[PDB]
Design a protein around this nucleic acid. Structure first.
Ligand SMILES: [Mg+2]
Length: 768
RNA sequence: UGGAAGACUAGUGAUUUUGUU
RNA sequence: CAACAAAAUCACUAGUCUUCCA
């Protein structure tokens, strides 16, 4: 039903001063008059319409507009701080800049007093849209493309191109009052200048002084220059650039198309590079624009102050004022869970290592095989011997002792060759635990391998690149053994028992789920814990409707996971925690209605009188956050430290939600995960639930580092990814076609039974 | 397919306005 | 008050490039 109110703002963790790129407000309570306008010819651009409106205000200033500074959305909506005399008869005018006709009609008055009332009641709308239209009308003229301010910055990229900068804007509500926000997002420009400069810089001869050019020198300038307007050093447009020079079509060089020389013509300035560029030009701007988090905060702080909207009367007509400094917040660092190995590790900065640490319950690998598909000359038997030696060494060091040589090794080619050999393997060796596979590149047979590995034969198929075999390193094989161990039913590590909050002091199951869509089936996966720590997650998966977000068959999946938990522990979980990734903000009211009830239904199916406490959470932008203290800047990227939580001055004013930056920022500016708590029967405090959501980011087995979202969610994502790798035989066959519309039901049932993982594989974390 | 993460291109959904019902 | 089409914003999802990790 209704999502719960915020129980409290929390107290646990460190204290850090933090800065969000939002901006404070003044928001006067005046009523802005809003009118509707019709402009002919309607096909003209919005910027041309705004220019026509300005020209009409200037031309008809005597009796119609006066000194007013109206703001126009571009097509229909116009706004003013004072009423116009046009109310409410037919008003039409003409403008000549190239001749246009316009009309004006008054609409209504958007009251900011209603905005103030909604800010402290009526739990807020025409008001926000009108404010968004008003707040960036004039600056958008400085950008026709875009609706944001620009700076007239110079920086030659290549082939006659340059870079000019500008930042995009937004306005969102928050506690007390609204908040404007700015984020730097720039573009690129094709250079405009005299054609002599094009011959010098772009053609790049020995000097200005040449001849009918070859392909490369021509394409350096002739191909790039197409698309720009030109004038006399007479407005014209470039429609073609000919390989044949002006003499055959400095006329002896390649010319532009009517034709123009290269000595008395200047390209028109102010034209942004509209066209999408070649692959080589994608990194030409990153050569001079690769920047980190401080090189976004500093740039925003410089440019917003350089704009200085408060100083100009032309935007102070409405009286709206925005503070220069960006928003200040207080953040808290959640403590990390100590990870216990069969050795206690602290996830320091969201990273820990397997140095002198072994798995909690290792698996003794006795009978194991290798199925190589790389070329024999490129991957010889000595390479396989070296890979075997390093794999055995790393597995021995990790508490998963691989014993002796592999019992089987054969070279093979073709995708269909995996199925017989593996069958023969399980026919010729009993107790075959591990089945290593070697594949070069993105070959399709990998999918076939997993289609033999998990679905039908039930063997722990592990795959590795040819380059990794040729270039084995300790880290690669360590991370590979980390998933080989859980593929064989082992347990890598467990959360420390005493370091967990009271939610863990009773039997509890931590469900998680995710859904992935095609680039036909939409795969929804649900994972559930199987022990009290937990580390071992059983997985269920269902193909469902195209692009559907709702997990249609969640009740049966939760029933299966609860049955497995009861059989594994002979106890019923008194609490249920259900994470849910992949949900859009517009669907929460539906999701909270549906999936929660289904979970309850599963409990009703497990036992008549069974009633645990369910917690329903959803995990998810432009809401960048940066440090304020110089000492708190971490690493090369300078991102906020891992585990920081923010739940004040930028989040929802009433509902329970919080931003959490669980993962460390390798590059750029990290996007914190926004956890919106949609339901809480257990009535967790902010501290306990935030600590739980942060600690479940460290039960992830595929690597020893903190992940962005909790392990129950990304495990469902991995299960869906593996199920995608698991049966579309229309593409596999030479041809595929049938009566679509009903036969896709047959394909759906086929996918359902194909993704039904084998029993030997069902009881272990194959999805690693 | 050793693992994690942030820049561009494209699909689904929620909302304000406009046109139709 | 709801659906379809257009503009804008927002959130997810997918692809192409790109950075780091013993
Ligand atoms: Mg996902």
């Amino acid at each position: 039903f209704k999502p719960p109110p915020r129980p409290d703002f929390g107290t646990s963790g460190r204290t850090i001063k933090l800065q969000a790129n939002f901006f404070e407000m003044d928001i006067p309570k005046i009523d802005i008059y809003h009118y509707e306008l019709d402009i002919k010819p309607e096909k003209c651009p919005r910027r041309v319409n705004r220019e026509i409106v300005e020209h009409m205000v200037q031309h008809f200033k005597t009796q119609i507009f006066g000194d007013r500074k109206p703001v126009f959305d571009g097509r229909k909506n116009l706004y003013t701080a004072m009423p116009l005399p046009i109310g409410r008869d037919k008003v039409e005018l003409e403008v000549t800049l190239r001749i246009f006709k316009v009309s004006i009609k008054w609409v209504s008055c958007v009251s900011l007093q209603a905005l103030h009332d909604a800010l402290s009641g009526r739990l807020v709308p025409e008001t926000i849209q009108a404010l968004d239209v008003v707040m960036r009308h004039l600056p958008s003229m400085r950008y026709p493309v875009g609706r944001s301010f620009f700076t007239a910055s110079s920086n030659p990229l290549g082939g006659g191109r340059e870079v000019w900068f500008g930042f995009h804007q937004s306005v969102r509500p928050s506690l007390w009052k609204m908040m404007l926000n700015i984020d730097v997002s720039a573009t690129a420009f094709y250079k405009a200048q005299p054609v002599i400069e094009f011959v010098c810089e772009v053609l790049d001869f020995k000097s200005i002084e040449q001849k009918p050019l070859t392909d490369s020198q021509r394409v350096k300038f002739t191909k790039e220059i197409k698309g720009l307007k030109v004038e006399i050093t007479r407005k014209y447009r470039v429609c073609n650039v000919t390989r044949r020079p002006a003499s055959h079509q400095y006329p002896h060089l390649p010319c532009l198309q009517t034709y123009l020389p290269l000595e008395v013509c200047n390209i028109v300035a102010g034209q942004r590079c509209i066209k999408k560029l070649t692959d080589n030009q994608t990194s030409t701007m990153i050569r001079a624009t690769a920047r980190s988090a401080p090189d976004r905060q500093e740039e925003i702080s410089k440019l917003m102050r350089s704009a200085s909207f408060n100083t100009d009367p032309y935007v102070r007509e409405f009286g709206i004022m925005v503070k220069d400094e960006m928003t200040d917040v207080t953040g808290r660092v959640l403590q990390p869970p100590s990870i216990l190995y069969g050795a206690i590790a602290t996830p320091v900065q969201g990273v820990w290592d397997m140095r002198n640490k072994q798995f909690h319950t290792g698996i003794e690998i006795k009978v194991w095989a290798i199925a190589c598909f790389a070329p024999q000359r490129q991957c010889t038997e000595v390479h396989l011997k070296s890979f075997t030696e390093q794999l055995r060494k790393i597995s021995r060091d990790a508490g998963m002792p691989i014993q002796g040589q592999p019992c089987f090794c054969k070279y093979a080619q073709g995708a269909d060759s995996v199925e017989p050999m593996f069958r023969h393997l399980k026919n010729t060796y009993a107790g075959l635990q591990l089945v290593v596979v070697i594949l070069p590149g993105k070959t399709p047979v990998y999918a076939e391998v997993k289609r033999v590995g998990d679905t039908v034969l039930g063997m722990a198929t592990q795959c590795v690149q040819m380059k990794n075999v040729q270039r084995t390193t300790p880290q690669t094989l360590s991370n590979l053994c980390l998933k080989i161990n859980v593929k064989l039913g082992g347990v890598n590590n467990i959360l420390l028992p005493q370091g967990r909050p009271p939610v863990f002091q009773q039997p509890v199951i931590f469900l998680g789920a995710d859904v992935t869509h095609p680039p036909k089936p939409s795969i929804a996966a649900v994972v559930g814990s199987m022990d009290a720590h937990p580390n071992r997650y059983c997985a269920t998966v269902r193909v469902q409707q195209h692009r559907q977000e709702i997990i249609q068959d969640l009740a049966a999946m939760v029933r299966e996971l609860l049955i497995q938990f009861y059989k594994s522990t002979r106890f019923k979980p008194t609490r249920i925690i259900f994470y849910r990734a992949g949900v859009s903000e517009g669907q929460f009211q539906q999701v909270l209605h549906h999936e929660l009830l289904a979970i309850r239904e599963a409990c009703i199916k497990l036992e008549k009188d069974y009633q645990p406490g369910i917690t329903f959470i959803v995990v998810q932008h432009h809401t960048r956050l940066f440090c304020t203290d110089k000492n708190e800047r971490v690493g090369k990227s300078g991102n906020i430290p891992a585990g920081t939580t923010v739940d004040t001055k930028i989040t929802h004013p009433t509902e329970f939600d919080f931003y959490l930056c669980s993962h460390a920022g390798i590059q750029g500016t990290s996007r914190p995960s926004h956890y919106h708590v949609l339901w809480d029967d257990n009535r967790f405090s902010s501290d306990e639930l935030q600590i739980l959501t942060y600690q479940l980011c460290h039960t992830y087995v595929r690597c020893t580092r903190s992940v962005s979202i909790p392990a129950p969610a990304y495990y469902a994502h991995l299960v869906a990814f593996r199920a995608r790798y698991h049966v579309d035989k229309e593409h596999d066959s030479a041809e595929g076609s049938h009566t679509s519309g009903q036969s896709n039901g047959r394909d759906h049932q086929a996918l359902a039974k194909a993704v039904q993982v084998h029993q030997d594989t069902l009881r272990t974390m194959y999805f690693a």
